[PDB]
Amino acid sequence: QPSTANGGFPSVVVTAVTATTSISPDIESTWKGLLAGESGIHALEDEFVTKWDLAVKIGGHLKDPVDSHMGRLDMRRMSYVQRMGKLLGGQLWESAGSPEVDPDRFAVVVGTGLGGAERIVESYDLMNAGGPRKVSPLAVQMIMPNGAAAVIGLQLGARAGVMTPVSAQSSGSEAIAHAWRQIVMGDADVAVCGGVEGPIEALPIAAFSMMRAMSTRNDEPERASRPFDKDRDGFVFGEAGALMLIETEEHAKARGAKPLARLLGAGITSDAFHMVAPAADGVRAGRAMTRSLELAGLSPADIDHVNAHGTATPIGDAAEANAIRVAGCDQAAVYAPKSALGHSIGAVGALESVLTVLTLRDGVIPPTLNYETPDPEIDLDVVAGEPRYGDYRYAVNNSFGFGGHNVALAFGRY
Amino acid sequence: SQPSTANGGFPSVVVTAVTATTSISPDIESTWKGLLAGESGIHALEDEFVTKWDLAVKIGGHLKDPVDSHMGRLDMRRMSYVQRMGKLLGGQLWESAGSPEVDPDRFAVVVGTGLGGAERIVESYDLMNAGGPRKVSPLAVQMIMPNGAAAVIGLQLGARAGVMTPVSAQSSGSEAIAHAWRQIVMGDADVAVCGGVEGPIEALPIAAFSMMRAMSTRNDEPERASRPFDKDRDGFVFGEAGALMLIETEEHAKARGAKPLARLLGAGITSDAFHMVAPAADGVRAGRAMTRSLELAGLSPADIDHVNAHGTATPIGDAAEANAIRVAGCDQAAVYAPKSALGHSIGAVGALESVLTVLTLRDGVIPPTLNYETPDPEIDLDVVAGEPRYGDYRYAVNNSFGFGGHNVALAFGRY
Numbered sequence A: 001q002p003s004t005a006n007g008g009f010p011s012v013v014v015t016a017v018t019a020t021t022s023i024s025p026d027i028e029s030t031w032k033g034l035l036a037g038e039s040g041i042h043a044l045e046d047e048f049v050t051k052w053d054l055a056v057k058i059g060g061h062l063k064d065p066v067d068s069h070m071g072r073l074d075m076r077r078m079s080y081v082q083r084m085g086k087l088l089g090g091q092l093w094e095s096a097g098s099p100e101v102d103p104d105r106f107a108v109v110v111g112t113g114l115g116g117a118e119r120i121v122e123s124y125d126l127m128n129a130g131g132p133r134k135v136s137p138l139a140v141q142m143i144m145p146n147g148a149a150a151v152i153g154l155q156l157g158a159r160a161g162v163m164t165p166v167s168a169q170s171s172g173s174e175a176i177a178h179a180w181r182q183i184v185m186g187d188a189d190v191a192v193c194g195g196v197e198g199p200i201e202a203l204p205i206a207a208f209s210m211m212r213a214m215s216t217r218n219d220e221p222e223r224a225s226r227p228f229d230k231d232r233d234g235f236v237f238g239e240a241g242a243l244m245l246i247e248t249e250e251h252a253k254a255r256g257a258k259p260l261a262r263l264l265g266a267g268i269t270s271d272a273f274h275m276v277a278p279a280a281d282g283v284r285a286g287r288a289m290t291r292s293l294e295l296a297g298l299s300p301a302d303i304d305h306v307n308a309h310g311t312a313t314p315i316g317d318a319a320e321a322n323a324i325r326v327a328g329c330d331q332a333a334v335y336a337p338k339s340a341l342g343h344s345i346g347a348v349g350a351l352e353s354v355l356t357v358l359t360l361r362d363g364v365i366p367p368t369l370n371y372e373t374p375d376p377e378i379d380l381d382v383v384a385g386e387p388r389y390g391d392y393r394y395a396v397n398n399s400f401g402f403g404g405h406n407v408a409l410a411f412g413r414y
Numbered sequence B: 001s002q003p004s005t006a007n008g009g010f011p012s013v014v015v016t017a018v019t020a021t022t023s024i025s026p027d028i029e030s031t032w033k034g035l036l037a038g039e040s041g042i043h044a045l046e047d048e049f050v051t052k053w054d055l056a057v058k059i060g061g062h063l064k065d066p067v068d069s070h071m072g073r074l075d076m077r078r079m080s081y082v083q084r085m086g087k088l089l090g091g092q093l094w095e096s097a098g099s100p101e102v103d104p105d106r107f108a109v110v111v112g113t114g115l116g117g118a119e120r121i122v123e124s125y126d127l128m129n130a131g132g133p134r135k136v137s138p139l140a141v142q143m144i145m146p147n148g149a150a151a152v153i154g155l156q157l158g159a160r161a162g163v164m165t166p167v168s169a170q171s172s173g174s175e176a177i178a179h180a181w182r183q184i185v186m187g188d189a190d191v192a193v194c195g196g197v198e199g200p201i202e203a204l205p206i207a208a209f210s211m212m213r214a215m216s217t218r219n220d221e222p223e224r225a226s227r228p229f230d231k232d233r234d235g236f237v238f239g240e241a242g243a244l245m246l247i248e249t250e251e252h253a254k255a256r257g258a259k260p261l262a263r264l265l266g267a268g269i270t271s272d273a274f275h276m277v278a279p280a281a282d283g284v285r286a287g288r289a290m291t292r293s294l295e296l297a298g299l300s301p302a303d304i305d306h307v308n309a310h311g312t313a314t315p316i317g318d319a320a321e322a323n324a325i326r327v328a329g330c331d332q333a334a335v336y337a338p339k340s341a342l343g344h345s346i347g348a349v350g351a352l353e354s355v356l357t358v359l360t361l362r363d364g365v366i367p368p369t370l371n372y373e374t375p376d377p378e379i380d381l382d383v384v385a386g387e388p389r390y391g392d393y394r395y396a397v398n399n400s401f402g403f404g405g406h407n408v409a410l411a412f413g414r415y
């Protein structure tokens, strides 16, 4: 059976990363911030919070709003996720040295949780007020959930496929998994991949709040997101979007690109357990991590580091601890970045994949914020307090989505 | 030499069961008979919303048998429409397959859709605007999320080897079958339910596509309106559908005694990077999606006896696809455009047309393309028309293209 280690798949490397977060618009600054213990989570000051008296009054808006970079035409003729895709795809391409690739070997794979949904409600209101001829001629292309990937594919010139996998909170990781598949199956030599997501707004907060999934520690915003802590009380929104450039090691060498890490293998499984709760036993989630190892050609004993999905729900973190045990990965050093950056839904697995890469590049794991009282059910080596330095070689990034979706990505130091 | 189905580098994958609901029939076998008899599912729309809004489009095909006549009280309150359609088709498919006892850890679901449970977005929005955040359902997130129908089916049927939802607008239903074939041939699953679901004809969808000037407005003769490849075409017509198939390795089928209907041999996915909604005129990357499906199957273009065209009956789309079929070397295939009779079901349609391609191979017959009356010289294809065309069809390609520049081609063969 082919694996990356045995040469049955070609070697695939990560050659550039870009992200915008609640800490910074610059991924390198976000990273320095994380290592210094910074949080992106603050009191929400939006008028919508008081207008509705929302139960949730905390979150991390982007440090640098996407629309501060957008012309007036884009603000009207693109949905928000498309604008985010255009901004991040252009940034990534510049970071990569604007390479001249063969468009016919270049794919784009970008996940998102929903798509241009503000344009659904806009079109509905316009039609209700004015009739069907008031709906924009650009409404379909702004709404369709493949819209952001399609904008990026047209902008950068990708003709080897433009794919949008949707798996709710695992979408951003799933996108990188399918990009890796598209390269190792021989359909592309280079891909832009990752995830984008909309901003914090009143209706998204109402819907998730009514699920009772969210922290309401509004008193102390930076202390609210507590993955694996005994006193955790649910997740916190933190806006983001993230893309990375991956390509065959061959392709990278031929253009002189310096790899940041290796993308070794990807596992996708599902729970068949519940529409929003993850299976308590962690078994299928663990098998996603095992599958990524099998395709990489690694054993769980090789794994140095897990970047946890770690949302800070009581049931979600308990299930993930079980998953990491099922996969034999519970001796590894664990980081839960949502402690600092909060949860960006369809973007978050992509953001956390970029963080995994930077851990491997720099030999360091940031502290998991708010990790103060260990939970006996969890029993994981959670990095906390100070950043932890080490010669990390191999890491798994976990992401799980409502609907029972498990995605694990195996990364290696270059 | 690289793996193909023909050289055994990929395992053999067979289609073992199919289910669809359409404007002609809730029964796929009765849909197929109807198509062969020249039936159309397109009629005048009778909905109050047409006259409320004075819509410029007044034709389309609603399902013959509405999904919600089969839904219980709780289903109507806990699922979006595409999830209800997914639960209904998933149970029908499983029964049609003999309710097999498969290993859940080797069983995947891959179901595409164009949008998701979007009616629950506008419902939630209205509820909150009237009554505040506490009026939003605690089920709103799971009903809205576009992976929702695939997740309902995966939970219903017990699939633990992955549940995926590729979105590529009007190619989503074919792209789902492509990713299901990949999940099997990469070794992640031995059996998969896959296809596509989509919402019903409603005013707001009509309004949005008719503002693109994309739709036929031949209201006085509804069965004559959808005219793919015809000189006098004037845009697409909505026809509701949902469709799923069961695929599995040949070994898995044989061990449980399943009778295959056809083989699924390979899949190509490319993109145009040309325009956000118009397909590239030159058909080059769409042709490459067909060629790639042939490479992975281990076929040559001369092997392809039949192409089931995406054929939406837009002036631009049909011309690009004819070019693409020529680029792929497949323009001596017999061509069927089923949207002529069933209309366009957006995220479902590639899956429905994949089911029809399987049936053409199983039965050795292509239905007539309806309304094909005046050949267009920029098209130059062998379009089946008038009576069905019979033959021992050995291999076929199904095409589907989506706004955003997405091209998907699926190669199938006779079992």
Ligand SMILES: CCCCCCCCCCCCCCCC(=O)O[C@H](COC(=O)CCCCCCCC[C@H](C)CCCCCCCC)COP(=O)(O)O
Residues within 6 Å of the ligand: A080, A113, A114, A115, A116, A117, A118, A119, A121, A168, A169, A197, A198, A199, A200, A201, A202, A203, A204, A207, A208, A237, A238, A239, A240, A343, A344, A345, A402, B120, B121, B124, B140, B141, B144, B145, B146
């Ligand atoms: C990290 C947060 C993640 C949230 C993810 C939630 C899903 C994201 C959906 C995209 C949101 C885009 C919002 C951008 C528009 C914007 O900014 O416009 C505001 C005005 O508000 C609006 O238009 C509200 C728009 C509401 C749109 C419908 C949202 C429906 C949400 C569902 C009921 C709940 C979430 C479903 C998630 C399912 C997928 C993942 C499991 C300023 O406008 P102005 O007056 O200053 O010009």
Ligand SMILES: CCCCCCCCCCCCCCCC(=O)O[C@H](COC(=O)CCCCCCCC[C@H](C)CCCCCCCC)COP(=O)(O)O
Residues within 6 Å of the ligand: A119, A120, A123, A139, A140, A143, A144, A145, B081, B114, B115, B116, B117, B118, B119, B120, B122, B169, B170, B198, B199, B200, B201, B202, B203, B204, B205, B208, B209, B238, B239, B240, B241, B344, B345, B346, B347, B403
């Ligand atoms: C073959 C047609 C394909 C259409 C494809 C459109 C794609 C989206 C389909 C989703 C539609 C689901 C509707 C089912 C619910 C239902 O039936 O609710 C009616 C009442 O109306 C409504 O709630 C209408 C609410 C509409 C929801 C928003 C739709 C937004 C459409 C966009 C502006 C335009 C299309 C975007 C497509 C992008 C993806 C593909 C390129 C029963 O009324 P009652 O029982 O309450 O009396």
Ligand SMILES: [K+]
Residues within 6 Å of the ligand: A307, A308, A309, A310, A349, A352, A353, A397, A398, A399
């Ligand atoms: K993670």
Ligand SMILES: [K+]
Residues within 6 Å of the ligand: B308, B309, B310, B311, B350, B353, B354, B398, B399, B400
């Ligand atoms: K077709």
Ligand code: NA
Residues within 6 Å of the ligand: B037, B038
């Ligand atoms: Na006849």
